[PDB]
Amino acid sequence: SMGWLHPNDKVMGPGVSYLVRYMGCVEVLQSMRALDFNTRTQVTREAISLVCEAVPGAKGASRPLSSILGRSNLKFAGMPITLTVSTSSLNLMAADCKQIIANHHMQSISFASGGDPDTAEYVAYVAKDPVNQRACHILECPEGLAQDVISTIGQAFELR
Ligand code: NA
């Protein structure tokens, strides 16, 4: 119930893997450091809402915070992946266990959070990549794993 869930060497070395469902991303148009924590949390909650209302079968299924949240990218939304969380990156690998959906360098991650009780299986993180710029990426996790994922993302960030 307290503290990191995995040995530090594991997170620093190969990373920790999870099976989750990538749910797409939502462009983020302000630096997270310019916003208060409560606002950061609202942005992630709303990004989760945006993707869940579009992607069929999403467990969590005018808009607020349109100054901060922009367009959705649904190209890879709904796809099962292996997420590998390490000190180098968040690595997102497709169901063939070959194709890389995304590899978000850890140094590019500027916020991570869960949802609320209605979206408790979701993880949101704000990253940069050359495709999506600053965007909020959404993962739908199996029961139990969302908090593990969020904790381990922090562990990786800190150990980097
Ligand atoms: Na390493």
Query: What is the CA(127)–ligand 1 centre distance, in A?
Result: 20
CA pair distance 143, 19, nearest whole angstrom: 11
Q: Do 92 and 83 contact (CB within 8 A), yes or no? A: yes
Q: Do 41 and 136 contact (CB within 8 A), yes or no? A: no
Q: Give CA 12 to chain center in angstroms.
A: 19
Compute CA distances 114 → 43, 62, 94, 104, whole Å.
11, 24, 22, 18
Q: Give this entry's resolution in angstroms.
A: 1.9
Q: Which helix (H) or strand (E) holds 6?
A: none
Q: Do 122 and 44 contact (CB within 8 A), yes or no? A: no
Instruction: Please state the φ and ψ torsions of residue 59, each to the nearest 5 degrees.
Output: -55, -35
Q: Do 123 and 112 contact (CB within 8 A), yes or no? A: yes
- DSSP per-residue codes, 131-147: TTEEEEEEEE--TTHHH
Q: Which helix (H) or strand (E) holds 18?
A: strand 16-28
Query: What is the CA(18)–ligand 1 centre distance, in A?
Result: 18
Ligand 1 (single-atom ion) residues, CB below 5 Å:
12
Q: Is 25 helix (H, G, I), strand (E, B) or coil?
A: strand
CA pair distance 131, 100, nearest whole angstrom: 13
- DSSP per-residue codes, 48-60: HHHHHHHSTT-TT
Query: What is the CA(66)–ligand 1 centre distance, in A?
Result: 38
Amino acid code (one letter) for 71: R
Return the bridge partners of 49, or none.
none
Tokens 């959070």 belong to residue: 113
Query: What is the CA(129)–ligand 1 centre distance, in A?
Result: 20
Q: Do 85 and 18 contact (CB within 8 A), yes or no? A: yes
Say what the alpha-carbon torsion angle 56, 46, 77, 158 is, to the nearest 10 degrees: -140
Q: Which helix (H) or strand (E) holds 24?
A: strand 16-28
- DSSP per-residue codes, 88-131: SEEEEEETTS--EEEEEEGGG--EEEE--GGGTTEEEEEEEETT
Pairing of strands 79-85, 89-94: antiparallel
Which method was it determined by? X-ray
Query: What is the CA(13)–ligand 1 centre distance, in A?
Result: 4
Q: Which domains does the chain have, with CATH numbers?
A: 1-160 (2.30.29.30)
Task: Give the CA count within 13 Å in the CB-facing half-sphere of 130.
Answer: 0
Instruction: Please state the φ and ψ torsions of residue 133, each to the nearest 5 degrees.
Output: 55, -145
Query: What is the CA(33)–ligand 1 centre distance, in A?
Result: 27
